[PDB]
Design an enzyme around this catalytic site. Sequence first.
Site, short mmCIF file in Angstrom:
data_model
loop_
_atom_site.label_atom_id
_atom_site.label_comp_id
_atom_site.label_asym_id
_atom_site.label_seq_id
_atom_site.Cartn_x
_atom_site.Cartn_y
_atom_site.Cartn_z
NE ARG A 114 -6.97 2.50 1.07
CZ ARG A 114 -6.41 2.36 2.26
NH1 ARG A 114 -6.87 1.46 3.13
NH2 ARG A 114 -5.39 3.13 2.58
N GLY A 174 -8.99 -4.82 7.77
CA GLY A 174 -8.35 -3.55 8.08
C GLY A 174 -8.47 -3.25 9.57
NE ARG A 215 13.40 5.52 -8.56
CZ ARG A 215 12.96 6.25 -7.53
NH1 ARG A 215 11.71 6.71 -7.48
NH2 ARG A 215 13.77 6.49 -6.51
CG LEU A 263 -4.46 -0.32 12.17
CD1 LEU A 263 -3.30 0.05 11.24
CD2 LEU A 263 -4.08 -0.03 13.59
CB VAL A 269 -0.94 0.03 1.22
CG1 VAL A 269 -2.03 1.05 1.01
CG2 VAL A 269 -1.56 -1.33 1.44
CD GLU A 307 -11.25 -0.19 6.22
OE1 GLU A 307 -11.50 0.47 5.18
OE2 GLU A 307 -10.13 -0.13 6.79
O1 LIG Z 1 -6.07 -1.13 9.04
C1 LIG Z 1 -6.69 -0.37 8.27
O2 LIG Z 1 -7.82 0.11 8.41
C2 LIG Z 1 -5.96 0.02 6.96
O3 LIG Z 1 -6.74 0.44 5.94
C3 LIG Z 1 -4.65 0.35 6.91
C4 LIG Z 1 -4.08 1.43 6.16
O4 LIG Z 1 -4.76 2.06 5.32
C5 LIG Z 1 -2.66 1.90 6.36
C6 LIG Z 1 -1.83 2.27 5.28
C7 LIG Z 1 -0.51 2.73 5.48
C8 LIG Z 1 0.01 2.85 6.78
C9 LIG Z 1 -0.83 2.49 7.86
O5 LIG Z 1 -0.36 2.60 9.17
C10 LIG Z 1 -2.15 2.03 7.66
MG LIG Z 2 -8.50 1.07 6.74
#
Ligand SMILES: O=C(O)/C(O)=C/C(=O)c1cccc(O)c1
Ligand SMILES: [Mg+2]
Length: 707
Positions: free
Chosen positions: A325, A442, A298, A444, A114, A417
């Site tokens: 995305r 996801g 590049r 987080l 990503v 997520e």
């Molecule tokens: O877990 C989620 O919801 C998810 O979508 C992760 C990310 O988008 C992300 C992308 C780059 C760095 C980061 O720390 C998190």
């Molecule tokens: Mg996310």
Amino acid sequence: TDRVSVGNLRIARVLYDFVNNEALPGTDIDPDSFWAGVDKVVADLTPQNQALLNARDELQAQIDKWHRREPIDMDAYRQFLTEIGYLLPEPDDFTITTSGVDAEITTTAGPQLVVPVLNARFALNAANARWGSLYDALYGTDVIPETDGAEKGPTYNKVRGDKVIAYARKFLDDSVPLSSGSFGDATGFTVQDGQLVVALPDKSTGLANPGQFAGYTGAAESPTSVLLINHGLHIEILIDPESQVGTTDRAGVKDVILESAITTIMDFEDSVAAVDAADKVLGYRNWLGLNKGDLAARVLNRDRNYTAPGGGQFTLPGRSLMFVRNVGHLMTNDAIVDTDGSEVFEGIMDALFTGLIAIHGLKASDPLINSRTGSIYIVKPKMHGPAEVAFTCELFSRVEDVLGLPQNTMKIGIMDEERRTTVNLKACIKAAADRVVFINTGFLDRTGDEIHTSMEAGPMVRKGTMKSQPWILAYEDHNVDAGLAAGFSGRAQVGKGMWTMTELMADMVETKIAQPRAGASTAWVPSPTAATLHALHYHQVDVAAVQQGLAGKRRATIEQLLTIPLAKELAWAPDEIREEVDNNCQSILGYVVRWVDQGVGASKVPDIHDVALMEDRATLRISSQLLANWLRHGVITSADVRASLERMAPLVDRQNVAYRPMAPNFDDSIAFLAAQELILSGAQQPNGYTEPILHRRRREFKARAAE
Ligand SMILES: O=C(O)/C(O)=C/C(=O)c1cccc(O)c1
Ligand SMILES: [Mg+2]
Ligand code: NI
């Protein structure tokens, strides 16, 4: 801002010009009827987009009231959730029918990268991360520790280089074994009667599995490289006694090259900051140069040529297969407004414009850059439950009609997520049965939605405790079960989440193997280097076998999924609460300041233990929501948060270069106020999303920097 009237829309001129002069040329789509399609889709689909957003709030407010109205009874909570239609009936078993998908998605298990689309160099390196140097990955990071002897420094260090070599030789032994002996003792490689022959000092050996020999380059009797395969991923030993490393090696090896980032997600969402037409055009342009092949700072790799074991020629893809995305259903953007000045839904725009742009990737560059089977791969984040998935489907079918593309050309990578998605995941997959190319946890965002959904029930456990709460362990397993049971094996990716600790590669290599061991055919890495080190795990884990053994399990109940991570009574000393507050405020402040002041949507921010963390909106969504929950339930006061924000702010100022401090005039700093608002207003953000505040405060800063 100057706009162009198409029907009921007023299109920001920089975006209108971009589509007409850059994005439409070469697609055989007629510009007047493209824009007419934009107008028609916006008008037809905006109402239900808005209804779905209202359903979210209406549902959250019911749940809020329910918690307010004493050890939580799960049976009552289930039935309330079912009754208000949050929890929906699980459909009957099925198998997805998504067709025309590439091997990198249907069949290859390996890392997935990503990268923020607005950073052209990052995006360029990510598209090039399909192949990466194992040596570079080990020499440059802490996988090889810097004990006495092995420290990096200004010059090359051979004691470290040797350990790098010894590490790679053991990977070869563990991945492509010799019939007898070890690659550590190899002195040369040749190809005799189409078979790989490794010279040991005494005897000579072949491959314990000769099928693992995939090809070579150079003359077969002293090749410039030997190409192996294991679990569908390629390993290329570069053979060059002339080079510095090669001279020192017992077999002249210069490097071990690993096929690494098999697919890459070009990100318009949480890892970028794009608040107007100027910002979106920059992203769209980079996405365009990626699909036309001429993006350069590049340049993009061409495919790689090999000689087959038999002596014929073949090629292998030199580039990561590219997803994009889109943003989700929530936000609007003034890049288009209507007659009334209402902004257009940004997600709808991403489907029209990223989809338009993606057509160049299906067609010869300047040789077809992206999908050879004819698909467009769009990640759709932050959907809430099956009706919202069907909406995304409807949008992609309407955009296909506008673009002139066969139905189901636009595939969906479903993020799992949001909690209403989790506890309805089977119906969310069925809702996209013929478009879905992955599900992914996801975690987080999923943790932010956990905190917000249950914001009224009580204090939550600390952020660092979430990772081992029962709801998340259930969620990760339940996602695999639903994937495998919808026939994802051989068809679509079962994907898990992101490693945020950008400099702890020893740790990533030691612990992230848990993801393929859990049946995931892909997982998220934040750099090409991390993609290379994560490939190791797929050579040690037979994901195909792992998935086969897990078929038919149902390992999480709906009760476990609904287990709210409430903190048990009075779990914290004063100093532990302080640390959570301080840490949360530092990471918030560090991320927000570069978001609002410099438009950077993904920043490495050290934390209270000085661990470098790659932050994006999801990790901000956790920290802001958690402090809002502690503040909501009396764990901390408003004096504490303001004190902590004031404490951490100068520390953030100090860690930063063409930059503007937040201290001492906190009330002058738009970045500081945005940070403060995310917390003190956190409980009132829809589902705890951080975009509404980040966008307003970024736009606020842009206007101030222009007066
Ligand atoms: O877990 C989620 O919801 C998810 O979508 C992760 C990310 O988008 C992300 C992308 C780059 C760095 C980061 O720390 C998190
Ligand atoms: Mg996310
Ligand atoms: Ni194996």
